[PDB]
Design a protein around this ligand. Structure first.
Ligand SMILES: O=C(O[C@H]1C[C@H]2CC[C@@H](C1)N2CCc1ccccc1)c1ccccc1
Ligand SMILES: O=C(O[C@H]1C[C@H]2CC[C@@H](C1)N2CCc1ccccc1)c1ccccc1
Ligand SMILES: O=C(O[C@H]1C[C@H]2CC[C@@H](C1)N2CCc1ccccc1)c1ccccc1
Ligand SMILES: O=C(O[C@H]1C[C@H]2CC[C@@H](C1)N2CCc1ccccc1)c1ccccc1
Ligand SMILES: O=C(O[C@H]1C[C@H]2CC[C@@H](C1)N2CCc1ccccc1)c1ccccc1
Ligand SMILES: [Cl-]
Ligand SMILES: [Cl-]
Ligand SMILES: [Cl-]
Ligand SMILES: [Cl-]
Ligand SMILES: [Cl-]
Lengths: 205, 205, 205, 205, 205
């Protein structure tokens, strides 16, 4: 329909693209994990592979609209290319994250954006003790690679990772999965960097 | 010929591209599988690799035409880039699907679009009991990743997967292969998401 | 020189690109294989890897010219992107074909195009009996994925595959290599699909 | 905000892109490594895999601005595509470097650019003696592939590689890690070529 | 500076791109190899992996300029995309060459282009006897895939491959490495094709 086309053209083509958050105009990105599977555990390189989907949500005054001005339409799906997206990166990654879902996000009239990328991540994790009852605990920090706390802040709706869609017949049973927000200072940089530490405790069944 | 060039121009260059389905203008995608081979089975990571080709069929009033108006031409082939395509994703995938066929679809004057992507998919599947006679059963859900039931609906012409082109000398014999439509409501989302559950029961020779 | 530049301009920039074959304007693609190696045989997944270069040659009235008008020039090399190319796909492929040669084709004044892509293909093949004197026979169908016989037809100049450039110190010795045209009907489709059957009989040296 | 959008426009859209350093206008790139993990060691091919992030730092008079002219904004983040980036290549690489971080850099009003690419590098390294107490030493040269000393000079803020973010539970312990500027002369070329030699001495736990 | 920007504009934007060599206007490409390593040797598939960088040197009247007309500038670096590059291909390759260096070339005022791509090549080679003192000899032909001798000629400045940057602690010691120009006739084609046979004799240390 023409109403969606006009809205899309007015938002993206008519106006310039969002130049990203500043110190003056900061942004708060909400993060959330849905752990689906612990696929592989490589004891010889201390590399662990996870399959999950990341909930990324944020709000821009830039992407707002009056639905009554565009034929009562509240939300729409658009390619992630048309919009600004947060550069949420996994620090301990050992191989590029593989995208497992379409690069499409949902934009709502209040300017709120919802992007749920499905990924396969290979990160640094010593699996020593996965064969025992007590299990093994591993962590990976997700945050903006380039933006400090002054520009992007991170928030989680819950500290508990979504295991509702965790692979039943997986080789590794989840004992605990936590999404904890943390502020960190790095040697290089005086400014702090916010991340969400994904902490998973697991053991083979 | 010039008649098709003009039709292709009047459809794609003259008019703006389809902004995807809405709640107001929904869409129904027909799905279907032709299972060719269960190539690999990784017992150590509970990963199974399938080679198949997926039938994607949908209809747009946008892509309709009077064949008499364009020198009696009923259907034409075009690059999938020129048209909107459904974001049909496999939920339990562990690695990005490899495309094994050209990105070309077929548009018919009634606006119906036919897209048959050939793919190699790696999904979550515990193959324990494949060495037995009873075999092992595994499933994978295919559906739109970003589009709900109110925007995209799924339909199957048959609940039986096409095994007519299944690799005779394959390492794994198909006992049963089913393609059935499902409706799911997830924790995240109030809106339902429609899928087609590919359920294959197999065993080694 | 300017004569070729002008010809290239008058053919590709001045005129719109070929919309592909139709039922009304069909096309006949000539195919040919030069088998270079049987690199890998995977007994555990019944996957065989071939390296070859495929001769694709077709003619378009679209790409014709009077060499006198363009400073006596019979032919020219151009990127495969500048022209329409047939969507010749291997049916039993298990992994995407890897391109091993530049995407350049030769165009002649009579509109005839010659395209020789070098590829590495992984296809379905049970190698049981390769360790024997009698050897093992495997086949792979090459044809247009999206076009029926009414649109594209296939032809071979010879039924004998070119083994003149077959890797001498290969782990597998070729007993016979045949390229044969065939017409087939698929369960899905009422229209027939033409392919060239590559049939190779081989054994380890 | 509009102030940054206008700045981004006046810098990138208004002016043509930087054609790279010349002999007349040379450039000095500061380099630095933060070694995160020695992932794999392949004794059979003398290939070693490192996970690290390289600090790239240069200044352009081209990218300078008066912050008081653009609503008091000192620095901003932009995609590496919008700007010129140094062609810092690892000489002994055996496989293409895998990018593990977003392609975003930070531009400051004095025209200074900070680019921190996270990478997985596979380079030539004989690990013979890694199983000993003394360990094994390996090196890799990083420098501009195409630009000489009179176009791109290299500098390090410190000769000590940043091990503050080195993977604690890694399979290989670090015994020493140093970033050292060196001038190379090649047979081919009249101008010398500058690099930073990354020298790491390590052993298994 | 504006002097180079203007030169780059007057060369690439103001004039059409070079349509490649013809029979009427032939070209001579100089080739050179700098062998860095024999990384892997696969005895089971008779595949050998080489790491090297190839000298590609050619002169075009098209790319010439008066340096006194463009603010005394002799040479400049540009992306290989901006210019025509020879389609030098390795005949016995078994997997696509991996690019290990930036796609930048150097253009001199006399119209001479220098392009030094660093590559990892996997080619057909029986390594039987590498464990011996005598070693094993292997060869790979490099030449234009689509252009005959009438179009492109190849030349080497020396028949001795550059081993000055050969990995000292490599698993395989080079006994001899030769780059020799060869003319061959192929079954397919009446016209001859010029190659540069890279011939390496090596053994494990
Ligand atoms: O800005 C730098 O690093 C940036 C890139 C990476 C590394 C630190 C921080 C800033 N950023 C990581 C932020 C982060 C991402 C995910 C999880 C936690 C933190 C920098 C690094 C070295 C020398 C000088 C400057
Ligand atoms: O919209 C979300 O998820 C969408 C992406 C994925 C996951 C659920 C659903 C909606 N979509 C999957 C739909 C589906 C695809 C294939 C097979 C079955 C269902 C979402 C996820 C987490 C938090 C907030 C919102
Ligand atoms: O049109 C279809 O399939 C097309 C794609 C593939 C599969 C059949 C045919 C037509 N095409 C293969 C043609 C072919 C290629 C290479 C070798 C032999 C045949 C189709 C498939 C399923 C349901 C409805 C329609
Ligand atoms: O310009 C050339 O080489 C360029 C590519 C490589 C090889 C030399 C130099 C210039 N460049 C290496 C520069 C370098 C990269 C990384 C670490 C140190 C030095 C060239 C090489 C051989 C024959 C003709 C021209
Ligand atoms: O022109 C052909 O092939 C071109 C590609 C390859 C094979 C022959 C020649 C021309 N070309 C080889 C060029 C070459 C590259 C590297 C090393 C030696 C020769 C051709 C082959 C089969 C049928 C019709 C035409
Ligand atoms: Cl794997
Ligand atoms: Cl595999
Ligand atoms: Cl392999
Ligand atoms: Cl690996
Ligand atoms: Cl490898």
């Amino acid at each position: 329909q023409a109403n969606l086309m006009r809205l899309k053209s007015d938002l993206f083509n008519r106006s310039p693209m969002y130049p990203g958050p500043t110190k003056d105009d900061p942004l708060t990105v909400t993060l959330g994990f849905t752990l689906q599977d612990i696929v592989k555990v490589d004891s010889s390189t201390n590399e662990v592979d996870l399959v999950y989907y990341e909930q990324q949500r944020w709000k821009l005054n830039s992407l707002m609209w009056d639905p009554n001005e565009y034929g009562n339409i509240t939300d729409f799906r658009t390619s992630a290319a048309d919009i600004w997206t947060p550069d949420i990166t996994a620090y301990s990654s050992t191989r590029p994250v593989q995208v497992l879902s379409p690069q499409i996000a949902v934009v709502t009239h209040d300017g709120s954006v919802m992007f749920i990328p499905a990924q396969r991540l290979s990160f640094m994790c010593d699996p020593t003790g996965v064969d025992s009852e007590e299990g093994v605990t591993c962590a990976v920090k997700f945050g903006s690679w380039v933006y400090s706390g002054f520009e992007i802040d991170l928030k989680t709706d819950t500290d508990q990772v979504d295991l509702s869609s965790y692979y039943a017949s997986s080789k590794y049973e989840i004992l605990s999965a936590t999404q904890t927000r943390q502020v960190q200072h790095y040697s290089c940089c005086p400014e702090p960097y916010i991340d969400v530490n994904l902490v998973v405790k697991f053991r083979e069944r």
